């Protein structure tokens, strides 16, 4: 009954933006820890008699083409390929979807080891669920092969000058709205507004990743062709972003 | 023959006050703010713990992740998911709106609103409905203070000139979008049906006997909704007239 | 030996509207018996050692504010109040909705003991699901507080001169179309035509009630302010009815 | 193995139109015998002290307002009325739905004693499940009160000149598609095509009724206002039929 | 490998249209065996014993008017007629729908003993679910009474010269699209395209029937009035077919 | 600890272009091996009776008309035909659907032995689930009988000049969207967009088949009438493709 004084005295408490924003980044939506993924791949890989660095490449390529269901893709695959996939499931304990944070999935391998994933996309652009030529028709120009995977969202700096990261994020969104339509045909009927909201939460988690620094992401964006040394966005990036803005 | 038993009920003591004493007793009340503060105080100090900081953390956790403690942990940083699990243990956190003595993250923000109303000034862009989003929907920069259902617990409806009704409508401009986000099934519905989905528990917070009419006056002034001369901010009135257009 | 002679002769058979209408009202839709409700409240109240006349008042007030779901309203109510509600559920065996005719619900208590319900509305007009000031905005004038509940339909005489009962019925319909929109938000999207048909069957049952006589209903309408002794409708009633006819 | 020759030999087998039509008269879809209903009402009514001619009226009025479930309607009815209903159930052995042909239901009483049922509808038009004013809104004009019951189908002559009987049948169908929507809300979602066929089998049985002759039905249609002495359809009938044809 | 050379050599492999159609009809969808139906009616009928030739007539007439649900039609029928129906269910073990091939249904009796079914339709044209006058309004002329039942599909030769069998099949389809709309009210809402596909599989089975020969069907089509001795289609048949083609394609 | 550096060290990593595509062709979606099907038909066929080359023909005809459920189609088939079907199930161990890759199904026989399947369609066009005349109505012209089966997708070269393979693929898609609607009536309600995505994965597997060479598929397309010797698409093919693009 006299709890009025207790609640009213919370009007003057520390509402500092330092610890509060420190808590939101702590309570931030995080599907998995990239540091944990690399560790478990390294540990379970070297303790098993394996060249994990090669297996990482194979798991990424496997994920970029077949998806994230290791047990399901084996039933419809060449026995020559289905054999080594069964191996990768055994040694690295592969699971499907997004379960626990210490469980290794094919999508998290591509997200953790993105600097190689961003290079593999440059090659097998026509073997993706959404082909390269398809994105070249949707966009006004030839859509950047680097952005043709959700793992690309883990190397984009939103704190770039002039808000360049927001432009790249929108440019990357042009692919994601089609990638979501393909991997989930139920979203095809929905317009771009509803589709964009189906991934804007886990994708935003990769953008605000504390795994790569602001300078590390700068090197990654330059070396792949999204941006140059003078931090100037490519013509393909800006034109792909303005087409995404025309869908919101 | 049962007419006299029933028809003679015309002269019965329609005592004004005791009838309303039953009405104020039967009023729709999701929870008791006095009970929430007590249980946070008791279970917090009996556990050897700094509850005042935990209140801050529980409010921040609620303002960003929602009201499902067990569900938000599965998709959160282990550094953060650890202390959330702590808050669930000591204060016995539950989800939704169950019993009145069960502490939920939404009730902590509602009970300890004077701090919740200050936190919104900071993490405006981390909310389910971002600050800039409300700045586009409203004609001006929508008051950050109103960007949570807990704001309804500090608004005086008995304000002169029906100013409380204006603030209530201004707060409704956010709630119709907050309901659309936390529940995408209401997105298809127009503003009329969405406004009726919260107008019952929200009205309960407005007619709260927890804060007095004078206590709510101090809270509205210190946060920027109204001034000392009881004059509504330009952002409040313009946000209300846009809600009346729905 | 009974081919056409019996059935074909029913063209010459009488079908006057005097005896027929008495059978329709006899064969009428009846949600519950007001005589049965009062009896069960009286019996179960005095046999349990409590003042039922006070409980009747509390059950009516409880119904006028919270509705007709006793088990649900307790979960969101003050423990001081949720305690005495649990009591009312125990002794009078309260149920929800409109089940059997001998099952006592909060809505039937207000309907049976309407002469007190019609007085309580004069007080708690702003605590109703549809507030008094709300009806004052919808109607051209201050809408009669007496009509602010479906229980009011049980005291209106349709056999009033000049069809005055039809006017009061329409005036009462102005509230019911909004009361149905509030207690059931799914009807909010529907226009007044579809909403009016959602209650025009149980409400018509209360209008043609054989519980109160034509003279008893006359006394009730006068003592509450709907009509005067000269059977002249109040200005608030007629103006509220003409707004309902426009829907 | 020579069974092929046996079936082919049915070309010369006899099939005169007299005996064949004699078999269809045994196989025609008949829910009940109107002659049997009238007899049982007369017998069981006169074998008791009951005035059956008055009870027939009450059973028809009871059916036109409450339906065809005597045991169920009593539980939600005034005790003054529920008392005499219980009586009608006792003496005439009333049942519900469409069971045996020798079992008397409230719907069959209205169908057998239709010349009185067709007159009662003129009075209690606003007490029906489908009100009179409702049919006045659906149809372009004031829909004939006589047609506001499935029992009306038992007095319409399909062998009328210029196919006038087909017009009245369609005009009566405008009410039945709404009557079926009300007594069975599950058919409300269905469009008029599916609803019209839910009754087109028992209704067609009443149309081809050998109970009333072609001349007896002529007298009934004239005396109630559906058609005049020169066999000219009323303006309300034809306009209600053309609105029903706009639903097929 | 050498299996590519092996598989590619199936281009030079023989595939005459004669043996293929024999495999199509051999691997064909078959609801029941007409030979089996006649046998079981003969055996179970004479062992009672029954005048089965008369019972066949009654079962056909019963099917042409009430349908294919013996247990259901009895509940709404005159006791004088419902009695002999109950008998037919007992002796010939009548079932409903299309279950096993050795189970006798009222629809299969009319299909097996079609030469009598095709004659009965000439009489009870106005007692059918789809009346004769109804088909006379839908079609430009008086629609052939012979075609007013799905059993008619069992006597039409598709191998007739000038593709005349395809014309009769389309002419018979004009009735089937309305017969399906009546016996199944859910198909009324659907257009003729979707309705025509609901029966085009069991109906095609009756057309390619090895029960009646190409010549036996010729005698049947002539004796009932669909075609003449010079294999010239009736004016009513062709005009009913061109009206069916204007809904289909 | 410094697992960040490890991830960044994959920037200057040996990312090939040959071996990667070698992994893609290894991980490519493959329902079955056409080489394996022909082998098992040859082995299990000669090891019992038997004229397998005739059985291949019968199994193809059986698949083109009844589908891919050997055990189910027997229950509704002539005993004369159901007998030899039971035989084919015995000797070649026939199963249904798409299980293992070493299990022989009726759909895989038609896909493996497509050069004969592509000739049978020219005859039994009106016995198919989707009749020939039906496709003649959907398309502006007489739709190529050769394309009237999913097995046709195994002989189309996507690496054809002027992107002709993409045109034939779209032309073949005009039939598949109707074939999927018939064999699975649940897809009938769905529009062409959703239906086209239900088969675009196993069908694309047949298009990129390493079984037939680019030159072998050329001979097959010419000899059946889809394309001529000058690699010019038939008028029926291009017009059927532009109608598929309209969906």
Q: Cβ(B242)–Cβ(B173) under 8 Å?
A: yes
Q: Which of D9, D30, D193 shows the shortest C-beta gap to E76? A: D30
- C-alpha span between B87 and A26 (Å, rounded): 15
Q: E98 to chain D, minimum CA–CA distance in Å? A: 21
CB pairs under 8 A between D and E: 100
Tell me which chain A residue has its CA closest to the CA of residue F10.
A116
Nearest to E30 among F76, F119, F223 (CB): F76
Whole-angstrom Cα Rg for chain C: 20
Distances (CA, A) of B191 to B138, B175, B244, E163: 15, 10, 10, 64
Packed helices D34-46 and D52-66: angle between N→C axes, nearest 10 degrees: 120
- CA-wise closest residue to E213 among E155, E167, E152: E155
Report the residue from B65, B112, B123 with minimal CB separation from A7. Answer: B112
Measured distance CA(E191)–CA(E246) in Å, rounded:
12
Question: What long-range pairs does B68-75 form, CB within 8 A, spacing at least 24?
Answer: B68/B95, B69/B93, B69/B94, B69/B95, B69/B105, B70/B95, B71/B95, B72/A27, B74/A100, B75/A29, B75/A30, B75/A31, B75/A98
List alpha helices for chain D, DSSP H.
Answer: 3-8, 17-27, 34-46, 52-66, 70-73, 79-91, 106-112, 114-120, 132-138, 164-183, 192-196, 202-207, 214-224, 235-244
DSSP-based three-state secondary structure for E201: coil
The resolution, in Å, is: 3.3
Please answer whether residues F123 and E20 qualify as being in contact, where contact means their C-beta atoms are separated by less than 8 angstroms: yes
Q: Is B200 helix (H, G, I), strand (E, B) or coil?
A: coil
Contact between chain D and chain F (3 or more Cβ pairs less than 8 Å apart): no
Check: CB of residue F226 under 8 Å from CB of residue F160.
no
- How crowded is the C-beta side of D71, counted as CA atoms within 13 Å? 6
How many other C-beta atoms lie within 10 A of the C-beta of residue A220? 23
| A89 vs F: CB within 8 A | no
Q: Which of C8, C13, C210 sits opposite D78 (nearest CB)?
A: C210
Could you give the CA distance from residue A60 to residue A81 in angstroms, rounded to a whole number? 14
- F233 phi/psi in degrees, rounded to 5: -65, 145
Neighbours of chain E (3+ CB pairs under 8 A): D, F
Which one, of B42, B71, B75, B44, lies nearest residue B57 by Cα? B44
User: What is residue E13's DSSP assignment?
Assistant: S
Tell me, yes or no, if B77 comes closer than 8 A to chain A by beta carbon. yes
CB neighbour class for F61 (10 Å; exposed up to 12, middle 13-18, buried from 19): buried
Q: Is B3 on the interface with C (CB under 8 A)?
A: yes
Chain E touches chain D, with at least 3 Cβ pairs below 8 Å, answer yes
Min CA distance, E96 vs chain F (Å)? 17
Angle at the Cα of B24 from the Cα atoms of B22 and B27, rounded to 5 degrees = 105
Q: Flag whether E touches A (3+ CB pairs, 8 A cutoff).
A: no
| Residue A45, number of CB atoms within 10 A of its CB | 18
In terms of phi and psi (left: phi > 0; alpha: psi -120 to 50; beta: otherwise), the region of D228 is beta
Closest alpha carbon to E91 in E79, E113, E109, E73: E109
Confirm if B166 and B237 have CB atoms less than 8 A apart: yes
Q: Are E116 and D12 in contact (CB under 8 A)?
A: no
Pairwise CA distance, residues F1 & A205, whole Å: 22
Residue indicated by tokens 């005791």: B18
Phi and psi, residue A227, nearest 5°: -140, 160
Give, in order, the Cα–Cα distances in Å from E217 to each of D88, E88, E120, E224, F127. 62, 29, 18, 11, 21
Q: Calculate the alpha carbon distances from A207 to A30, A103, A117, A175, D207 in Å.
A: 11, 21, 16, 16, 75
Q: What is the dihedral of CA F239, F240, F241, F242, to 10 degrees?
A: 50
Interface test with A, best of F9, F12, F17, F20 (most A CBs within 10 A): F20
In A, which residues are within 8 Å of B126 by CB distance? 21, 24
Give chain D positions within 8 Å (CB) of E34.
Answer: 7
Burial class (CB in 10 A: 0-12, 13-18, 19+), A174: buried
Q: Which H/E stretch holds residue A238? A: helix A235-244
Using an 8 Å CB-CB cutoff, list chain A residues near F169.
Answer: none
F108 is in an annotated binding site: yes
Cα dihedral A187, A190, A193, A194 in deg (nearest 10): -60
Answer yes or no: do C112 and B196 touch at CB < 8 A.
Answer: no
Whole-number Å distance between alpha carbons of F159 and F221? 13
Chain B residues closer than 8 Å to C61 by CB: 19, 22-23, 26
Out of F15, F21, F23, name the one closest to residue A116 (CB). Answer: F15
CB atoms within 10 A of CB E123: 19
Distance of alpha carbon A76 from alpha carbon F99, whole angstroms: 9
CB contact under 8 A, D123 and C17: yes
Of E116, E186, E211, the CB nearest to D10: E116
Structure tokens at C104: 């006592």
Contact E113/D7, CB-based, under 8 Å?
yes
- The Cα–Cα gap between F183 and B20 comes to 68
Q: Does E4 touch chain F (CB under 8 A)?
A: yes
Question: Could you tell me if D52 and D46 are in contact, meaning their C-beta atoms sit under 8 angstroms apart?
Answer: yes
Sequence-distant (6+) residues with CB within 8 A of C127 are B20, B23, B27, C64, C65
> What does each C-alpha distance from F141 to C146, E29, E166, F136 come to in angstroms?
76, 29, 20, 6
CA D108 to chain centre: 8
Rounded to the nearest 10 degrees, the angle between the axes of helix C52-66 and helix C79-91 is 120
- Please state, in angstroms and rounded to a whole number, the distance separating the CA atoms of residues C66 and C72: 10
CB A34 within 8 Å of CB A211: yes
**Which stretches within F67-142 are classed as H helix?**
70-73, 79-91, 106-112, 114-120, 132-138
F143 is in an annotated binding site: no
Phi-psi map region of E65: left, alpha, beta (phi>0 left; psi -120 to 50 alpha): alpha
* A-chain residues near B118 (CB < 8 A): 11, 13, 15
Mutate to test the interface with F, among A64, A79, A111 (most CBs of F within 10 A): A79
Candidates B35, B60, B184, B219: best to mutate against A (most CBs of A within 10 A) is: B60
| Whole-number Å distance between alpha carbons of D23 and A165 | 86
Distance (Å, rounded) from C-alpha D62 to C-alpha C23? 8
Task: Report yes or no: E115 and E152 within 8 Å, Cβ to Cβ.
Answer: no
Please tell me whether residue F10 adopts helix, strand or coil conformation: coil
Which residues of chain D does E84 touch, with a Cβ-Cβ cutoff of 8 Å? 26
Which of F163-170's residues contact partners 24+ apart within 8 Å by CB, and which partners?
Answer: F164/F227, F164/F231, F164/F233, F165/F207, F167/F233, F167/F237, F167/F238, F167/F241, F168/F221, F168/F226, F168/F227, F168/F233, F168/F237, F168/F241, F169/F207, F170/F241, F170/F244, F170/F245
Q: Is E65 on the interface with D (CB under 8 A)?
A: yes
C24 touches chain D (CB under 8 A): yes
How far off is chain E from D111, nearest CA to CA, in Å?
16
Asked if E57 is an interface residue toward chain D (Cβ–Cβ < 8 A), one would say yes
F186 has a chain A CB within 8 A of its CB: no
Q: Does F4 touch chain E (CB under 8 A)?
A: no
Buried/exposed C159-178: b ≥16 CB within 10 Å, e otherwise = ebeeebbebbbbbbbbbbbb
What ranges do the domains of chain F cover? 1-247
C20 touches chain D (CB under 8 A): yes
Q: Cβ atoms within 10 A of the Cβ of D21, count?
A: 14
Q: Which two tokens stand for residue B226?
A: 């109204």
- List the structure tokens of F64: 């083109």
Structure tokens at B58: 């529980």
**CA dist., res. C46 & res. C53, Å (int):** 10
For residue F29, what are the β-bridge partners? Answer: A77
Q: Is C218 exposed, middle or buried (0-12, 13-18, 19+ CB in 10 A)?
A: middle
Structure tokens at C17: 């509207």
The reply to whether F11 touches chain A by the CB within 8 Å rule is yes
A18 touches chain F (CB under 8 A): no
User: Are the beta carbons of F27 and A123 separated by less than 8 Å?
Assistant: no
Residues linked to residue E29 through DSSP beta bridges, in sequence order: F77
């Amino acid at each position: 009954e006299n709890y009025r004084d207790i609640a009213l005295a919370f009007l003057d408490e520390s509402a500092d933006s330092g610890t509060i924003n420190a808590w939101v980044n702590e309570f931030a939506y995080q599907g998995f820890d990239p540091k944990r993924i690399v560790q478990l791949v390294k540990e379970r890989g070297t303790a098993k008699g394996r060249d994990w660095k090669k297996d990482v490449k194979m798991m990424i390529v496997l994920n970029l083409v077949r998806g994230n269901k290791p047990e399901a893709m084996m039933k419809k695959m060449s026995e020559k390929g289905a054999s080594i996939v069964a191996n990768l499931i055994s040694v690295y304990q592969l699971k499907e979807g997004n379960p626990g944070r210490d469980t290794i999935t094919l999508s998290r391998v591509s997200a953790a080891f993105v600097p190689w994933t961003v290079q593999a996309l440059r090659v097998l652009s026509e073997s993706l669920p959404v082909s390269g030529t398809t994105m070249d028709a949707i966009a006004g120009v030839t859509y950047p092969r680097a952005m043709m995977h959700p793992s690309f969202a883990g190397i984009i700096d939103l704190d770039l000058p002039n808000g360049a990261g927001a432009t790249i994020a929108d440019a990357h969104g042009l692919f994601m709205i089609e990638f979501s339509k393909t991997i989930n045909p139920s979203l095809r009927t929905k317009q771009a507004n509803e589709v964009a909201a189906t991934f804007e939460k886990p994708n935003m988690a990769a953008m605000s990743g504390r795994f790569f620094t602001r300078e590390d992401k700068k090197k990654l964006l330059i070396a792949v062709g999204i941006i140059d040394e003078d931090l100037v966005l490519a013509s393909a990036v800006v034109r792909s972003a303005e087409k995404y803005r025309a869908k919101v």
